[PDB]
Swiss-Prot record, chains A, B:
During the substrate-folding cycle, the two GroEL rings separate for effective substrate binding and chaperonin activity. Ring separation is triggered by ATP binding to the trans ring of the asymmetric GroEL:GroES complex and avoids formation of functionally impaired symmetric GroEL:GroES2 complexes. Activity of the GroEL-GroES chaperonin complex requires Mg-ATP. UMPylation of the chaperone by SelO/YdiU negatively regulates its activity, and may facilitate survival under stress conditions. The modification N6-acetyllysine is found at residue 116. It comes from Escherichia coli (strain K12). Changing residue 397 to A: Can bind ATP with normal affinity, but is defective in ATPase activity. Binds non-native rhodanese, but cannot release the protein. This is Chaperonin GroEL. The keyword Cytoplasm applies. Its main location: cytoplasm.
Length: 524, 524, 136
């Protein structure tokens, strides 16, 4: 539709207002004295947040040329959350600083393209330096500290996440749920578990608890739905002669087969459990084949012509114990080989090297949870539902942030390591003065995380900067107790991944934005 | 619907503001210190760009007489991209300059329509001198230099495109797309790869990679959906009597055919595989004949009644290896009779040369890359999505400009060769003085590219223009390092294809526009 | 009964005010230079080529742009009120140092270290203008 168009001043001044209006709304949450933001929603009622990406995602403005600034910095705020959960405010703080301090250089008249080349050379150096400084985390105390830092001084949530990690290990899986009590809970399962259970309740043999018990059973697995007992009888008569209970994981069970299996249990002939296969789409076939290699069984797949009408006792899997309700099943210790189970984990772990989506990185980790270091779940504990919202953020995005710490490592916190790598790059040269100033725009923002924590405290940012830059090593200032010392032993370390990624996304959005000489939009 | 109307003065005054609102925006990105434009969007991330055709394509006004002016310069910007790729800003800069210098003649009192009759003869002269001067761009440093310049002074993109041309050849295929790196990656392909993955996962003989492997197979080529093994059995028995693996490349393979092929594999009888129509529609039949020439095969089709029931090992194609994954099939050399391959590959080069659209140019150029030449793909290295978008854009059209610089050649750049043809045509004359002023409209515009580069560079346009006119030939001003020398040595080359196109479309739009004595359009 | 304005909006008004006066004073400079006319409405307009004329007789209507014009009513006049000549020259130099210094103050440099840099340059330039002088 019909446009307005704005150049130079009228571009960069509107852009600067829009960037600062968005950034100011995000800035107010950072550190131990960092505060909260309220977001209204016409779909029901408001929600309180402490995260910058929640705030940034909601904004859109009346003035088109300022809306442009907000809609650009919305991308760096998402790129932090989409990479690591946390670091969203930090990335926005760095972005607004590299934008403002680069616009200062562009308006002083340094070449916008050599300013970008100088920012880029500083980003490369700072990324390699943050790798070189990346601790070497391994003790569960450092894990609990990065958990309590992200959960915002929460001893309990940091201890809960870190003890889940200490228990399930480097390649178990921890998940999270909208909770059921007025208190939090970690649940952990020392067995295989999945999205389905019984097709008839009359087989509950403990009315006291509601469970169906299968003591050291056989397990039969089929990709087809079963409708005639004709399809089972060859295995059935052999399993009766073998003297053991049986689980049938078909895709589905119906017809006369369901009733006749239920009657063979009801009248005391043989204990037979019918279940539907867990999940939907070929994720169902994948979990059926996971159970097969865990238990020592065949998968009878009708889609490749496999007659259930000739399956044997050799085609059965076995286990130490199985326990069933209507909608879930738990299996304890399947009879399949250690080398076959770890080879099963290796096949899933190979796909984790090429799992190019979020739902892939879910449905592949689902399958290592069931086999390797185990399955665990955090129930979000809260009294109010505005508290269920914020506590769930401080357990979802904080689990994603502690995972992000575990992969790349950690550095000396409150931004102090970012100031230390900035001090090492004080002597970093470009090719010309415009690139020297460009390097000295990117490095200029590396005090901003510390300065914005000290501003959230209500205290003087450039004072703490000029003490921190006098002292050496891990020397910094504790924003929660108001003393100077080693940041690590004062409790404070930042994850490498959130720091390093926030710096890149900030400098990327800034170095592509400060070069703006014209801005175009449809009429108001 | 009712009109507004404007004449002569009042027409041309509004039309000129329209021409400026387009072309003075498009101006702000040009040269080695060239800046950025941003395009506002409420739907998500705003579009940062450097490209004059994307900046032009947006522009639109509610003052319809300024809209008409802007839309005419939008056409020359489109014609630059749609017929040459790069030079979009250069065409737009030349358009407003030839418009300005032509309006300056119309308002001084020259015969308005004989200005086009003189401009067109000056276009002939300028196009023919640019052909007479056209280097012969072809060495890897010259290729890397035109890629460096088109990518906006990015030696990495220039080197990367040259390092792909180094494997695929002059007329081979290289594309670029969405990646996951913090640094770029090149994949390269010889033989043939095509869209269609494996039809069963129980064929994956490397759990470590996800790949299916066929060592020297026979290959059947079948234009009908094979639901039944019935039609295969005589050919299957002939291939069993040779002890080699099989692949069916068909319309489709399904039903009891797919099941029995997968079972004969899974039980350990013989590796016998199948895949469906590559691409979509009858691209089936078309590329199945290219596969037939590559493999040494006969194509069987049911639409013309071909009995598969009698085909032999001589009617089959063969390969050294075939490898299949989750999306694609790669033939690691089909056998194929070279005396037919070269004739068919030359006949595809014929079908490329006479191609009738961009979608034709695609589906024909693929067919030399997927045979004798090479295919290649750049997986984009970029942190943010604004960076993914800009990096893909700069690589996409530098990949266009590199070929454009080989096919029609190059001249000494930054407009310096354009200034050299301006000095060559001082004594050029037509049938009268109006045509002589007309010829001189085109020549007067030839300082504009240089002047707008030097203005983007923040230096004095009129000074560099008059010093460059004091020297001769390829001597010019390096607007990146800020100094005078040989433009060829410093990599500053204007591609003949983009220069020749920019001059033609600018002169054509201007020569039809400056004659405007009335304008008609609907009420706002 | 004051209006009052700070920062951004004040500096933007001050600049336009300086320009409205000094860009008129610019139209006359040199032998190929043009002329201006000014209404002494008590009897009739006066014709001129000079900066002290075009400064003294002008007074605007936006009060904040008028403040800019009134401040340069010293800098354009202090020429003819002490040195005789140089009215337009002083005005041309004044609007240039104002424009480029306000450009630096908008970019975000310290206004008083900008002054200390101007003053260091002026201190040298006053000696250099004697070093490049020959007597009359």
């Amino acid at each position: 539709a019909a446009k307005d168009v704005k150049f130079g001043n009228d571009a960069r001044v509107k852009m600067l207002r829009g960037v600062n209006v968005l950034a100011d709304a995000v800035k107010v949450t950072l550190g131990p004295k960092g505060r909260n933001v309220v977001l209204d929603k016409s779909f029901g009622a408001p929600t309180i947040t402490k995260d910058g990406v929640s705030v940034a995602r909601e904004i859109e403005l009346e003035d088109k040329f300022e809306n442009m600034g907000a809609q650009m910095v919305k991308e760096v705020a998402s790129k932090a959350n989409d990479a690591a959960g946390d670091g969203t405010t930090t990335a926005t703080v760095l972005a607004q600083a590299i934008i403002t301090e680069g616009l200062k250089a562009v308006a002083a008249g340094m070449n916008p393209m050599d300013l970008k080349r100088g920012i880029d050379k500083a980003v490369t150096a700072a990324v390699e330096e943050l790798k070189a400084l990346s601790v070497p985390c391994s003790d569960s105390k450092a894990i609990a500290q990065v958990g309590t830092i992200s959960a915002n001084s929460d001893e309990t949530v940091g201890k809960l996440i870190a003890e889940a990690m200490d228990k399930v290990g480097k390649e178990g899986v921890i998940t999270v749920e909208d909770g059921t009590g007025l208190q939090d809970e970690l649940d952990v399962v020392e067995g295989m578990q999945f999205d389905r259970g019984y097709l008839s309740p009359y087989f509950i043999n403990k009315p006291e608890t509601g469970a169906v018990e299968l003591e050291s059973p056989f397990i039969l697995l089929a990709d087809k739905k079963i409708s005639n007992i004709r399809e089972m009888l060859p295995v059935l008569e052999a399993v009766a002669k073998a003297g053991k209970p049986l689980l049938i994981i078909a895709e589905d069970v119906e017809g006369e087969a369901l009733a006749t299996l239920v009657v063979n249990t009801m009248r005391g002939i043989v204990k037979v459990a019918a279940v539907k296969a867990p999940g939907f789409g070929d994720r169902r076939k994948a979990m059926l084949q996971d159970i097969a290699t865990l238990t020592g069984g065949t998968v009878i797949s009708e889609e490749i012509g496999m007659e259930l009408e000739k399956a044997t006792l050799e085609d059965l899997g076995q286990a130490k114990r199985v326990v069933i309700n209507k909608d879930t099943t738990t299996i304890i210790d399947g009879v399949g080989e250690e080398a076959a189970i770890q080879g099963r984990v290796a096949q899933i772990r190979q796909q984790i090297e090429e799992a190019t989506s979020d739902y892939d990185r879910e449905k592949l980790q689902e399958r290592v949870a069931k086999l390797a270091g185990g399955v665990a779940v955090i129930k979000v504990g809260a009294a109010t539902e505005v508290e269920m919202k914020e506590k769930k953020a401080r357990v979802e995005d904080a689990l994603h942030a502690t995972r992000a710490a575990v992969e790349e490592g950690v550095v000396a916190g409150g931004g102090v390591a970012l100031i230390r790598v900035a001090s090492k790059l004080a002597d970093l040269r470009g090719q010309n003065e415009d690139q020297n100033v460009g390097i000295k725009v990117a490095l200029r923002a590396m005090e901003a995380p510390l300065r914005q924590i000290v501003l959230n405290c209500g205290e003087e940012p450039s004072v703490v900067a000029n003490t921190v830059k006098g002292g050496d090593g891990n020397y910094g200032y504790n924003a929660a107790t108001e003393e100077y010392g080693n940041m690590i032993d004062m409790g404070i370390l930042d994850p490498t991944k959130v720091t390093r990624s926030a710096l890149q996304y900030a400098a990327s959005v800034a170095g592509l934005m400060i070069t703006t000489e014209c801005m175009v939009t449809d009429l108001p």
